[PDB]
Amino acid sequence: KVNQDGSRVLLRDVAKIELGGENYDIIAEFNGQPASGLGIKLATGANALD
């Protein structure tokens, strides 16, 4: 908004903006060290080693 005055309101002021993950449910620690893995799950009647 613009206010009845001249003071401008933008969500830099009203909110804290950071570039973070969309969910904060899961975290991964490989040997204690912070990590992120790709746990690939098999299909159905696929090819396994292939």
Added chain:
Amino acid sequence: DVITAIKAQNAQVAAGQLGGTPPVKGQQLNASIIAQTRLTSTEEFGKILL
């Protein structure tokens, strides 16, 4: 007015949870918040305010 008042009271909404996903390190408890619920009977539909 009847229609609009129905979906305004017979609503099953989605409110979050106490101590959500990104927490304040030191939080002890977590509980899902229930706001409105879907009306179950003919009598509860009778008490819907217009």
